[PDB]
């Protein structure tokens, strides 16, 4: 299975504000990659069901209600497949603010400098029924953040292992960090595994290329 | 001013991998606005939009170029969708399908070579459909009108872009994108008459140590 | 001038019916534009649209009226969707859920009785959520501003509509709709200041000979 | 399971042309009925997959291509369920023109006066692969038409039986015609059946209520 490495550059007419151009990309792990440019809407969007989940996150409804509603939405879906687990991270690229939605633990970690914090909510909702083990979190990322997400297989006290090993990373490169973190989990076995393993890593960085600084004429 | 950026990586191992795995992941990026990443334990998380979906299906038919162009037109004449430059890569065998509506155009750089992406009556919406077999190390470059028709006093834009891509002393997609943007902007003088978008994709062999 | 119309019927028998059947059917009508009917042999054919879907899900939660109103508002304040009068009937037990956004309002006629559909802080979009238990022979009547606020010099519109519905000497939905439209139009003089829409639904016992 | 009987009336401001009001309804057989009014889009729409099929019908692409494309669209769907059969009738309410899309025979019949014609294409496409047995038809209906659609169970030379019995109907009322046609199929058994039976009937009629004729002032 081939990988793709991508990159993009975008500039509005009269260097400022909003553009008639749009570009998008999407990757279905190990299967399909798509990229679109349009010169004048979003070329790609979430699932029927993930669209609904996103709308709840986006709303800013209080957290207990969001959890209740997500549970209900999750509640009525095609029994096959049960759509657990779900680990979903949505980064806003204007302010680098990230909303996390988890359905059936994961967990995910944010490495900042040498500090590796786990992605979890400060206030855990109690005194309710949460049948799908739904968790909703809001962190604020900044340039140089490394968000690592993993499945049950690779993740399996495990926080200490991940925390330590993520400090042990001497590289800032996502495709490298992923492969190494895989390597470390596998040699701990010393061979193949019965369970599926996937890890994705995302690095946040602050777009400041030379052409961005080329000045437009004055009057 | 400029929005934040994202650089991503993923590693995947099937159980005794192996044909299949319950696990799946996906990502999508709405340029400059939104990045999403999803992991699920044993129906993709993200998909094309409604109109791109019908066009995507027609591509995936494999029907004759002549009729697909004709049938996509009829579809588009019942919308405007503006222009569309769509590249779809199969990560299993690196084959690629291109759907162009309203031109573009696009280029592939294979070693020192650079070729335009084109297919070997009335075409109302200027539709093209193309297939290619990519290879590890290929660089696919997509761009809007403002980059490609950007250079100030250039007769043959095709030739200008090839020559510039042939001169890229870099296999890094983000550098290439930024370099091509810069070269166009400087032919004017920080002046940006049209919106400018470039997307660069590199095909890699997935073959880590495990 | 006026569009064509449709009058529909369906009969369904499960195998030794019986809890379940591979067969399903559906219909939908986009008022004055489109009618569709589907039969399938062993995922509904038609569904609410994207925004109605989220609102529909919230209704089907069953969450507290106070918070559902509050949560639907927050949802609507991220769109305008205009107004929405939505009635959803469960054909198994004849229970009914109503979602009103931006008023309406609506009425149910049970025998000689006629009651308005209403639920026993800031409500930005004027949202109501209501549940009722309907019964064989009930007549549910829905209408837009132009019908209900239509009558020329009437102080209490609620009372005008009840009195008129109480006087319906007819259990046929299409007749009721046409009669109510006529009564409003004549209070003006063929003059139609606003758009006028009325929808009438009657609940029947399905109990044919078999 | 309850039934609903419905009706509706609609009039644009200043009796003519296009309205800010819209109304819709939908019924999921034996399960759910919904009705919406909006005072200013369609409240209800087809499936993800039926949307795509509809777009192909709507396009006026030639028939062989439409059949090929529908097959491909049909071709890539969730293996469960195989979504065969499909009998789909779409009436345009402006001109009473009906597009039929069939996936795995049915068939459906249009009764006009005492004439009962079967819904099939005049030119059947040959020299192709049609894996889902896709059929696409275009008839023009008129006031007083009775379109009858049925599943494999009730329909089972059967055309002669349906044709005769549909002539034998002495009623113009859809919910009656359906129940009778069920009755006739069942007594032919004389009890219950192993196979599922459903029939839907649609009568086309030409909207001309009294209020439509009430005149608006002249100058
Ligand atoms: O693989 C690289 C790219 O894949 C794309 O589908 C993702 O959207 C992401 O925006 C990029 O990182
Ligand atoms: O049952 C009656 C009604 O059901 C509705 O869902 C259908 O859309 C049809 O427009 C009506 O006939
Ligand atoms: Mn697992
Ligand atoms: Mn442009
Ligand atoms: Mn109005
Ligand atoms: Mn059957």
Which of the four CATH numbers 3.40.50.720, 3.60.40.10, 3.40.50.300, 3.40.190.10 does domain C1-210 have? 3.60.40.10
Task: Please name the member of A36, A83, A193 whose beta carbon is closest to the beta carbon of B84.
Answer: A36
- Cβ distance C28 to C36 under 8 Å? yes
D54/chain B closest Cα distance in angstroms:
11
Q: Which residues pair with B26 in a beta bridge?
A: A28, B38
Which has the closest alpha carbon to B204: B114, B101, B127, B89? Answer: B89
Which has the closest alpha carbon to A18: A37, A35, A40, A36? Answer: A40
B neighbour chains, 3+ CB pairs within 8 Å: A, D
Handedness of CA C88, C90, C94, C95 (dihedral sign): negative
B153/chain D closest Cα distance in angstroms:
42
Name which of C15, C23, C60 to mutate to probe chain D: the one with the most chain D Cβ atoms within 10 A of its Cβ: C23
Can you list the alpha helix ranges (DSSP code H) found in chain B? 50-61, 65-76, 145-148, 157-166, 173-187
Distance (Å) from CA B32 to ligand 1 centroid: 13
Q: Is A4 in the pocket of ligand 1 (CB under 6 A)?
A: yes
Interface check for D52 against chain B (CB to CB < 8 A): the answer is yes
Q: Is A50 in the pocket of ligand 1 (CB under 6 A)?
A: no
- Cβ distance D25 to D5 under 8 Å? no
- Cβ distance B72 to D56 under 8 Å? no
Alpha carbon distance D105, D137 (integer Å): 12
Alpha carbon distance D19, B51 (integer Å): 27
CATH second-level architecture of A1-219?
A: 4-Layer Sandwich (3.60)
- Cβ distance D4 to C89 under 8 Å? yes
Hey, where are the domains in chain D? 1-219
- Cβ distance C118 to C65 under 8 Å? no
DSSP A113: T
Between the alpha carbon of residue B207 and those of residues A2, A63, A200, the distances in Å are 9, 42, 16
Name which of C62, C64, C67 to mutate to probe chain A: the one with the most chain A Cβ atoms within 10 A of its Cβ: C67
Name which of A72, A99, A131 to mutate to probe chain C: the one with the most chain C Cβ atoms within 10 A of its Cβ: A72
If one counts every other C-beta atom within 10 angstroms of the C-beta of residue D217, the result is: 8
Return the ligand number nearest the Cα of D5.
Answer: 2
- What are the tokens at D193? 């059946």
- What are the tokens at C47? 């569904």
D neighbour chains, 3+ CB pairs within 8 Å: B, C
- What are the tokens at B78? 């019942």
- Cβ distance B126 to B101 under 8 Å? yes
- Cβ distance B177 to A8 under 8 Å? yes
Distance (Å) from CA A208 to ligand 1 centroid: 20
- What are the tokens at D52? 């795509």
Note whether B63 contacts D76, CB cutoff 8 Å.
no
Residue of D nearest to C210 (CA): D183
What is the length of chain B? 210
* A58: chain C residues, CB-CB within 8 Å: 78
- Cβ distance A100 to A136 under 8 Å? yes
Alpha carbon distance D33, A210 (integer Å): 60
Q: What is the DSSP string of D41-97?
A: --SEEE-HHHHHHHHHHHHT--HHHHHHHHHHHHHSS-SSS----EEEEEEETTT-E
Note whether C48 contacts D33, CB cutoff 8 Å.
no
* A216: chain B residues, CB-CB within 8 Å: 190-192
Return the ligand number nearest the Cα of A198.
Answer: 3
Between the alpha carbon of residue B152 and those of residues B120, B146, B147, the distances in Å are 30, 11, 11
Note whether D212 contacts C88, CB cutoff 8 Å.
no
DSSP D118: E
Alpha carbon distance A155, D35 (integer Å): 49
Note whether A91 contacts B173, CB cutoff 8 Å.
no
If one counts every other C-beta atom within 10 angstroms of the C-beta of residue C41, the result is: 23
Alpha carbon distance C118, D207 (integer Å): 33
What is the length of chain A? 219
* Residue C52 falls in which region: left (phi positive, over 0), alpha (psi -120 to 50) or beta: alpha
D29/chain C closest Cα distance in angstroms:
5
C117/chain A closest Cα distance in angstroms:
25
Task: Please name the member of A32, A94, A216 whose beta carbon is closest to the beta carbon of B91.
Answer: A32
Interface check for B78 against chain D (CB to CB < 8 A): the answer is yes
Distance (Å) from CA B195 to ligand 4 centroid: 6
Note whether D59 contacts B53, CB cutoff 8 Å.
no
Q: Is C44 in the pocket of ligand 2 (CB under 6 A)?
A: no
Backbone φ and ψ of B197, nearest 5°: -130, 130
Obtained via which technique?
A: X-ray
* D4: chain C residues, CB-CB within 8 Å: 89, 91, 201-204
Distance (Å) from CA D37 to ligand 6 centroid: 36
Alpha carbon distance B88, A26 (integer Å): 10
Alpha carbon distance A110, C139 (integer Å): 58
Which atom of ligand 1 has the smallest separation from the CA of A33?
6
Distance (Å) from CA A40 to ligand 4 centroid: 7
Residue A173 CB partners (closer than 8 Å, separation 6+):
A203, B7, B9
Note whether C71 contacts A78, CB cutoff 8 Å.
no
Chain centroid, CA A151 distance in Å: 13
Which atom of ligand 1 has the smallest separation from the CA of B28?
8
Which atom of ligand 1 has the smallest separation from the CA of B26?
6
Name which of A1, A7, A101 to mutate to probe chain B: the one with the most chain B Cβ atoms within 10 A of its Cβ: A7
Distance (Å) from CA D25 to ligand 2 centroid: 6
SS (H, E, C) chain C: CCCCEEEEEEEEECCCCCCCCCCEEEEEEECCCEEEEEEECCCCCEEECHHHHHHHHHHHHCCCHHHHHHHHHHHHCCCCCCCEEEEEEECCCCEEEEEEECCCCEEEEECCEEEECCCCCCCCCCEEEEEEECCCCCEEEEECHHHHCCCCCCCCHHHHHHHHHHCCCCCCHHHHHHHHHHHHHHHCCCCCCCCEEEEEEEEEECCCCC
Task: Please name the member of A1, A6, A211 whose beta carbon is closest to the beta carbon of B91.
Answer: A1
């Amino acid at each position: 299975s081939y990988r793709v490495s991508t990159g993009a550059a975008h500039a509005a007419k009269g260097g400022g504000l909003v553009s008639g151009d749009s570009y998008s990309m999407m990757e279905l792990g190990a299967r399909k990659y798509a990229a679109a440019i349009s010169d004048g809407r979003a070329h790609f969007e979430s699932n029927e069901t993930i669209k609904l989940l996103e709308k709840i996150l986006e709303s800013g409804i209080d957290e207990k209600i969001a959890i209740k509603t997500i549970n209900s939405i999750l509640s009525l879906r095609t029994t096959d497949e049960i759509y657990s687990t779900l680990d979903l991270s949505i980064i806003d690229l204007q302010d680098a603010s990230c909303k996390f939605l988890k359905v059936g633990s994961t967990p995910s970690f944010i490495k900042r400098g040498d500090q590796v914090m786990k992605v979890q909510a400060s206030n855990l909702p109690i005194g309710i029924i949460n049948e799908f083990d739904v968790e909703v979190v809001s962190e604020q990322l900044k340039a140089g953040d490394l968000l690592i997400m993993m499945s049950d297989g690779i993740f399996e006290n495990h926080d200490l292992w991940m925390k330590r090993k993520m400090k042990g990373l001497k590289t800032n490169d996502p495709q490298e960090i992923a492969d190494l973190l895989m390597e470390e989990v596998i040699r701990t076995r010393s061979g193949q595994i019965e369970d599926d393993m996937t890890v994705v890593v995302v690095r946040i960085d602050h777009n400041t290329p030379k052409w961005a600084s080329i000045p437009v004429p004055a009057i």
